[PDB]
């Protein structure tokens, strides 16, 4: 178990790395490729490379040692890049979709531009930065006996200090809500009339270039679809187990204190998997990704 775990760490490190580079560099190489949609993915792969690099080697050393051996200031920074990180990517994903959605449904009210893009983009980290700053004061590194932290820190654990019970089920029930249930329940409603738009609609005078219009705009539909869709299976597990845990009181039996840890052990890495997936998503939904990724393999090999 312990080795696979490193494995699995690993093998995420160097792919959600190199695929997330390959994929900024291919939307700069390739000019009509800096699409409004494309730029929001870059921002969505800085997010990636941001946790990647940063959060997931404190994500190893912490599932695998079950301590904190990083000091106090990094249990205060680390936590909050990786909250940052999965900010700036549900608040990425819903400005796609909305994106797409004032562009199949309602086409005429808003334009977007690579210009208005860059400024959401900006909006996107003002806001990331700002909400989770709460969730940074909270972090602690505290021993289990505090006299011991004078010692050694194999024995010291960052986790959140909360002064009574009701404010951790407050807090821990609205970034629930606000970052993964309404995101992803306005998504899927989104894209689902954004289906029904790209398949279905008939009108009998359409011109042969509001076709060619319609064939290119499904083929980005669904990749955008299978990319909200990994994320929102590989977010739900870390999900549900932080309100079970936080809200509903759970896992404080030591029973079954060796399933628990593997559960949450495997919900830490399918946040970074999600990092890891998407570049490999453009790969094969997207032939002008899959063009770029090509030619970046070429000038290596
Ligand atoms: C988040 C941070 C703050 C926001 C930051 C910005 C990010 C925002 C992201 C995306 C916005 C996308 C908007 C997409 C809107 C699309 C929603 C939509 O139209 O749904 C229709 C109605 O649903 C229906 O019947 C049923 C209505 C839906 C009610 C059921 C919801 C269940 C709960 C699930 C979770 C809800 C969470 C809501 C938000 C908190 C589908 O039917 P139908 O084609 O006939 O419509 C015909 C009708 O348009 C005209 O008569
Ligand atoms: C090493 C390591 N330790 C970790 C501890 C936690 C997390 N992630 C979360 O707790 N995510 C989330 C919590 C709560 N609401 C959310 C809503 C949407 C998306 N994500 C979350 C990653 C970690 O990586
Ligand atoms: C919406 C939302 N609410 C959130 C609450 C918490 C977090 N993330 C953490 O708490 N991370 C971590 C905590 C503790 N040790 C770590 C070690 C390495 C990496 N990460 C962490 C993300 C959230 O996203
Ligand atoms: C019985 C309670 C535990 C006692 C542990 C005593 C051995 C600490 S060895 C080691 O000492 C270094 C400085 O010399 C520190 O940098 C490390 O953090 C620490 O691990
Ligand atoms: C020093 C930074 C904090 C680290 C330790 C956090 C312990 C609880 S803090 C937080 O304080 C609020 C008032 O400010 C209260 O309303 C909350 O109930 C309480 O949870
Ligand atoms: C969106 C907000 C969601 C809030 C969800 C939690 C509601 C409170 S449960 C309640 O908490 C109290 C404080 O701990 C205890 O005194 C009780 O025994 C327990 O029944
Ligand atoms: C066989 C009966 C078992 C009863 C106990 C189940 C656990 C209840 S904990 C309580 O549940 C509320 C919802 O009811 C949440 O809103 C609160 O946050 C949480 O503190």
Same mark, same amino acid.
């Given at each position: 178990?312990?080795?696979?775990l490193?494995? +699995?760490?690993?093998?995420?490190?160097?792919?959600?790395?190199?695929?997330?580079?390959?994929?900024?560099?291919?939307?700069? /190489?390739?000019?009509?490729?800096?699409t409004?949609?494309?730029?929001?993915? #870059?921002?969505? %792969?800085?997010?990636?490379?941001? *946790?990647?690099?940063?959060?997931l080697?404190?994500?190893?050393?912490?599932?695998?040692?079950?301590?904190?051996? =990083?000091?106090?200031? !990094?249990?205060?920074v680390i @936590?909050?890049?990786?909250? $940052? %990180?999965?900010?700036? +990517?549900?608040?990425?994903?819903?400005?796609?979709?909305?994106? &797409?959605?004032?562009?199949?449904?309602?086409?005429?009210?808003?334009?977007?531009?690579?210009?208005?893009?860059?400024?959401?983009?900006?909006?996107?980290?003002?806001?990331?930065?700002?909400?989770? #700053?709460?969730?940074?004061?909270?972090?602690?590194?505290?021993? $289990?006996?505090?006299?011991?932290?004078? /010692?050694? /820190?194999?024995?010291?654990?960052?986790?959140? &200090?909360? *002064?009574?019970?009701?404010?951790?089920?407050?807090?821990?029930?609205? =970034?629930?809500?606000?970052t993964?249930?309404?995101?992803?329940?306005?998504m899927?409603?989104?894209?689902?009339?954004? =289906?029904?738009?790209?398949?279905?609609?008939?009108? @009998?005078?359409?011109t042969?270039?509001?076709?060619?219009?319609?064939?290119?705009?499904?083929?980005?539909?669904?990749?955008?679809? $299978?990319?909200?869709? #990994?994320?929102a299976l590989?977010?739900?597990?870390?999900?549900?187990?932080?309100?079970?845990?936080?809200?509903?009181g759970?896992?404080?039996?030591?029973?079954?204190?060796?399933?628990?840890?593997?559960? =949450?052990?495997?919900?830490?890495? !399918?946040?970074?998997?999600?990092?890891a997936?998407?570049?490999?998503?453009?790969?094969?939904?997207?032939?002008?990704?899959?063009?770029?990724?090509?030619? +970046?393999?070429?000038?290596?090999?």
């Amino acid at each position: 178990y312990a080795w696979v775990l490193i494995a +699995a760490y690993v093998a995420v490190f160097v792919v959600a790395l190199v695929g997330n580079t390959l994929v900024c560099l291919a939307v700069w /190489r390739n000019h009509h490729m800096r699409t409004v949609t494309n730029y929001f993915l #870059v921002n969505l %792969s800085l997010a990636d490379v941001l *946790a990647t690099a940063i959060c997931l080697p404190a994500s190893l050393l912490v599932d695998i040692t079950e301590s904190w051996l =990083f000091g106090h200031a !990094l249990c205060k920074v680390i @936590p909050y890049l990786q909250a $940052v %990180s999965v900010s700036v +990517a549900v608040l990425t994903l819903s400005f796609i979709a909305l994106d &797409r959605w004032y562009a199949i449904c309602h086409p005429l009210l808003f334009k977007s531009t690579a210009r208005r893009a860059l400024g959401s983009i900006l909006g996107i980290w003002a806001v990331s930065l700002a909400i989770m #700053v709460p969730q940074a004061a909270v972090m602690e590194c505290s021993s $289990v006996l505090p006299e011991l932290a004078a /010692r050694t /820190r194999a024995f010291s654990v960052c986790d959140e &200090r909360w *002064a009574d019970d009701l404010a951790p089920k407050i807090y821990h029930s609205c =970034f629930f809500i606000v970052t993964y249930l309404a995101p992803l329940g306005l998504m899927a409603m989104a894209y689902f009339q954004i =289906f029904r738009k790209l398949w279905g609609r008939q009108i @009998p005078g359409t011109t042969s270039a509001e076709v060619k219009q319609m064939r290119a705009r499904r083929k980005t539909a669904k990749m955008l679809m $299978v990319v909200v869709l #990994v994320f929102a299976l590989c977010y739900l597990p870390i999900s549900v187990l932080n309100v079970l845990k936080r809200v509903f009181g759970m896992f404080r039996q030591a029973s079954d204190r060796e399933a628990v840890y593997a559960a =949450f052990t495997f919900s830490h890495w !399918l946040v970074y998997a999600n990092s890891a997936a998407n570049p490999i998503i453009y790969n094969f939904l997207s032939g002008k990704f899959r063009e770029q990724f090509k030619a +970046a393999f070429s000038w290596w090999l």
